[PDB]
Amino acid sequence: ARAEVHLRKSAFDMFNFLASKHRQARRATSMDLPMPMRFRHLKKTSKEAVGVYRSPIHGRGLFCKRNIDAGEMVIEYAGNVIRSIQTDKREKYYDSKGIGCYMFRIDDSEVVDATMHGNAARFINHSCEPNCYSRVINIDGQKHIVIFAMRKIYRGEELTYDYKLPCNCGAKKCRKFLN
Amino acid sequence: VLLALHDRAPQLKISDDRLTVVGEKGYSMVRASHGVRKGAWYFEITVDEMPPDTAARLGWSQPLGNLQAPLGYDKFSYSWRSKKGTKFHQSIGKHYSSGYGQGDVLGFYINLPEPHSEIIFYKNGVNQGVAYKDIFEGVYFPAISLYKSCTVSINFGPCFKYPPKDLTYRPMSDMG
Amino acid sequence: PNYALKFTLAGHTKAVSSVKFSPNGEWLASSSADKLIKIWGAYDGKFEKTISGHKLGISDVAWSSDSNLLVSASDDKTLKIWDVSSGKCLKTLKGHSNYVFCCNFNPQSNLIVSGSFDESVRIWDVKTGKCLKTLPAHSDPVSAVHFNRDGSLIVSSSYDGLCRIWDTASGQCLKTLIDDDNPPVSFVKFSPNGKYILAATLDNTLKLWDYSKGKCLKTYTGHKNEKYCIFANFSVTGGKWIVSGSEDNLVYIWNLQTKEIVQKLQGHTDVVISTACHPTENIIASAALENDKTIKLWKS
Ligand SMILES: Nc1ncnc2c1ncn2[C@@H]1O[C@H](CSCC[C@H](N)C(=O)O)[C@@H](O)[C@H]1O
Numbered sequence: 067a068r069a070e071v072h073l074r075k076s077a078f079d080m081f082n083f084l085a086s087k088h089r090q091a092r093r094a095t096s097m098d099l100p101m102p103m104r105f106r107h108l109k110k111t112s113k114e115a116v117g118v119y120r121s122p123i124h125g126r127g128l129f130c131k132r133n134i135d136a137g138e139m140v141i142e143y144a145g146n147v148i149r150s151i152q153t154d155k156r157e158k159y160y161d162s163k164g165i166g167c168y169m170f171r172i173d174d175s176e177v178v179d180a181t182m183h184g185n186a187a188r189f190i191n192h193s194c195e196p197n198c199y200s201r202v203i204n205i206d207g208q209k210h211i212v213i214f215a216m217r218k219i220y221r222g223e224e225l226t227y228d229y230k231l232p233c234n235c236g237a238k239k240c241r242k243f244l245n
Numbered sequence: 246v247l248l249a250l251h252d253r254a255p256q257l258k259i260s261d262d263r264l265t266v267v268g269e270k271g272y273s274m275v276r277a278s279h280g281v282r283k284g285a286w287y288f289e290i291t292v293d294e295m296p297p298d299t300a301a302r303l304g305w306s307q308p309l310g311n312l313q314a315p316l317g318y319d320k321f322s323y324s325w326r327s328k329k330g331t332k333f334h335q336s337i338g339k340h341y342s343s344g345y346g347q348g349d350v351l352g353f354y355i356n357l358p359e360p361h362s363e364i365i366f367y368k369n370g371v372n373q374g375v376a377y378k379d380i381f382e383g384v385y386f387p388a389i390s391l392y393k394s395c396t397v398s399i400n401f402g403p404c405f406k407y408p409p410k411d412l413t414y415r416p417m418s419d420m421g
Numbered sequence: 422p423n424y425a426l427k428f429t430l431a432g433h434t435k436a437v438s439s440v441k442f443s444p445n446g447e448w449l450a451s452s453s454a455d456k457l458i459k460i461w462g463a464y465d466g467k468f469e470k471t472i473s474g475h476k477l478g479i480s481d482v483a484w485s486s487d488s489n490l491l492v493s494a495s496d497d498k499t500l501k502i503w504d505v506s507s508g509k510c511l512k513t514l515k516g517h518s519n520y521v522f523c524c525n526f527n528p529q530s531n532l533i534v535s536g537s538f539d540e541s542v543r544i545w546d547v548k549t550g551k552c553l554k555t556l557p558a559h560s561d562p563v564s565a566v567h568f569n570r571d572g573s574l575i576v577s578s579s580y581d582g583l584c585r586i587w588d589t590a591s592g593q594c595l596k597t598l599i600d601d602d603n604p605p606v607s608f609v610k611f612s613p614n615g616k617y618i619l620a621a622t623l624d625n626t627l628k629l630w631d632y633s634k635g636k637c638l639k640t641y642t643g644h645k646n647e648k649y650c651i652f653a654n655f656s657v658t659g660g661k662w663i664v665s666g667s668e669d670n671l672v673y674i675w676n677l678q679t680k681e682i683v684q685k686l687q688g689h690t691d692v693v694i695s696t697a698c699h700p701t702e703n704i705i706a707s708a709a710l711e712n713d714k715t716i717k718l719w720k721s
Pocket residue numbers: 081123124125126127166167168189190191192193232233234235
């Protein structure tokens with residue numbers, strides 16, 4: 067009230083989602099339809115099946131409002147497909163800038179960064195007993211990081227997979243090592 | 246002289262006669278299978294077809310640089326820009342030297358007595374920047390990283406076109 | 422550049438919350454958190470009335486364009502609406518979970534923007550008082566907002582260096598004023614045409630940003646503004662002066678043509694948090710916090 071100059075001002079976050087509320091077989095990815103049909107379904111339906119909400123696990127997350135089936139596709143981790151030595155340059159850069167580093171790879175040649183270019187798959191937390199995993203698929207010569215499910219993922223459950231460092235997983239199978 | 250089969254970047258356009266080096270997008274540096282060790286070894290990189298806006302980095306590099314490294318990333322690989330001759334080594338910004346011209350018979354030399362180095366950008370025996378000095382003892386790979394798909398040759402024939410003047414190199418008919 | 426002190430509007434019992442002119446240019450009234458919105462005159466400091474009838478203190482009072490209707494951003498987390506003409510308890514409007522720090526009006530005089538400390542810019546109704554919308558503004562409380570020349574935009578003064586020019590009708594973030602620094606943005610306002618931005622970041626430097634292009638043009642040197650959310654103004658009645666409050670017991674008024682120290686006014690004994698300009702004539706509101714409790718009529 068105009069006299070007590072208070073702290074807790076800067077956030078160091080490029081995104082600003084923290085609102086007052088932050089309200090957290092038919093489909094081809096569960097069918098035996100071919101991989102181009104599943105991949106064409108994935109980009110059209112990851113925009114409308116899941117959503118980004120504020121995460122009590124860590125930061126902001128991916129809180130689905132739908133009974134996600136077992137083994138099906140959920141989201142595609144698409145961002146800056148940079149070379150493997152541009153990884154260290156952007157790691158030093160966003161160490162100097164404070165933005166969190168998001169570098170999950172396909173192989174040991176080029177690593178998908180998710181800092182400038184990215185999607186809603188930046189907001190995937192880590193549970194050591196997760197509900198998803200990933201498999202390297204092949205579409206049109208390109209490779210795509212596709213998050214395949216594990217079980218029936220209910221309404222409200224945040225989406226996590228195995229990344230392969232103490233985590234906020236909350237699970238009892240916790241490794242605390244992600245190197 | 247047979248080029249590299251495994252210790253190179255296989256997505257680059259190394260030709261089928263294995264005497265012509267053409268690069269692609271992304272600074273993956275193709276390195277030939279003949280890393281110099283000692284004595285005096287000089288090869289040429291005969292630039293023939295090169296479009297403009299190509300920062301054709303030529304120089305020297307050690308095996309601890311990546312196959313996906315740009316030529317001039319770290320403390321082991323030199324750098325040579327077409328634009329204003331700006332060199333970046335140990336990540337140091339130095340608008341230092343000159344560039345080059347299209348069609349010049351390139352090919353550089355690093356001096357390895359069996360230490361005393363002569364690291365100058367040897368374009369046709371003409372100075373394009375006295376680059377660096379005082380290397381360690383070890384293997385030094387050929388170092389070609391490209392920004393576009395330019396068609397340049399590489400020479401291993403002993404009757405060289407434009408070597409450094411009064412260079413007592415060993416002829417490259419003893420490397421393969 | 423010869424603003425002379427005329428009178429003293431003494432009578433305040435706490436830190437003077439605001440000193441803003443009425444839109445008729447005839448009522449430089451004032452308020453404080455003592456539940457005493459002291460309605461004073463403009464030319465001599467003649468007493469008119471005092472609005473009371475709150476529960477807790479008062480943060481902000483804002484002027485409707487008829488110089489009469491006053492909404493109170495009172496610290497009991499209500500939006501109690503009062504009047505220069507009558508002073509009736511018109512609408513007591515609760516709803517915000519934290520302190521309603523600042524309040525402003527559109528130039529159409531039919532919306533109640535509510536910059537509270539609850540990190541949610543809600544909008545309220547003049548006639549009845551319904552919570553119209555709720556802007557997901559920031560992870561920071563709100564210190565200052567403003568509408569443009571008609572009321573179609575909402576500028577934000579966040580605390581992590583964000584000035585999001587919010588939409589008013591559809592209500593989404595249109596442009597985020599970006600800064601690699603994250604300063605506590607104190608008091609932003611649109612230009613009187615609606616096409617330039619004066620972002621008062623707390624680095625002892627005022628920043629005039631373009632709205633169309635988006636880059637800074639001119640700054641100011643030699644003023645003390647780091648801790649408090651010191652208000653800045655625009656003055657074209659004399660020169661192109663920029664009226665602002667002070668912390669070293671001055672009245673910070675300098676020119677965009679000069680950008681340096683060319684005129685200083687003096688006499689306060691506390692931090693001047695609120696300043697204002699007369700729209701036509703050369704009357705400048707200057708009043709500090711609790712250790713002054715006086716309003717100083719500077720007049721050229
Ligand atoms: N479950 C988890 N517990 C703790 N840290 C996690 C985590 N999952 C991911 N992280 C780490 O935390 C970072 C996420 S950034 C935090 C979320 C988002 N940027 C936001 O706050 O709006 C990533 O770099 C990741 O390495």
